[PDB]
Design a protein around this nucleic acid. Structure first.
Length: 60
RNA sequence: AUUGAAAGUUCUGUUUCGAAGAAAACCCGCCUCAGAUU
């Protein structure tokens, strides 16, 4: 085996836990596809947060 | 350079079509700004 570690390090994107409130929400939205011969429904989760992330790179 | 090193759960879809808060009803019946002055 041969190995080579990545030169760029990235971490998870998590909203800031600042103060006593978490500024993030998550709701479910309902969507329909229209057809002329019914015999057509799906749901998707949407969010809105305040994200923060940090990274490292070694150009040397 | 660490049971570490390499990995997108991603692509495609209308909550649409139609339906007058409408008809009836007096705010109204009585009252002085009046007597004195070059």
């Amino acid at each position: 085996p041969v190995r080579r570690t990545s030169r760029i390090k990235l971490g998870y994107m998590i909203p800031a836990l600042r103060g006593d409130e978490i500024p993030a929400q998550l709701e479910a939205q309902f969507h329909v596809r229209f057809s002329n011969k019914p015999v057509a429904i799906f749901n998707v989760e949407v969010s809105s947060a305040l994200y923060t992330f940090s990274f490292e790179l070694d150009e040397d």
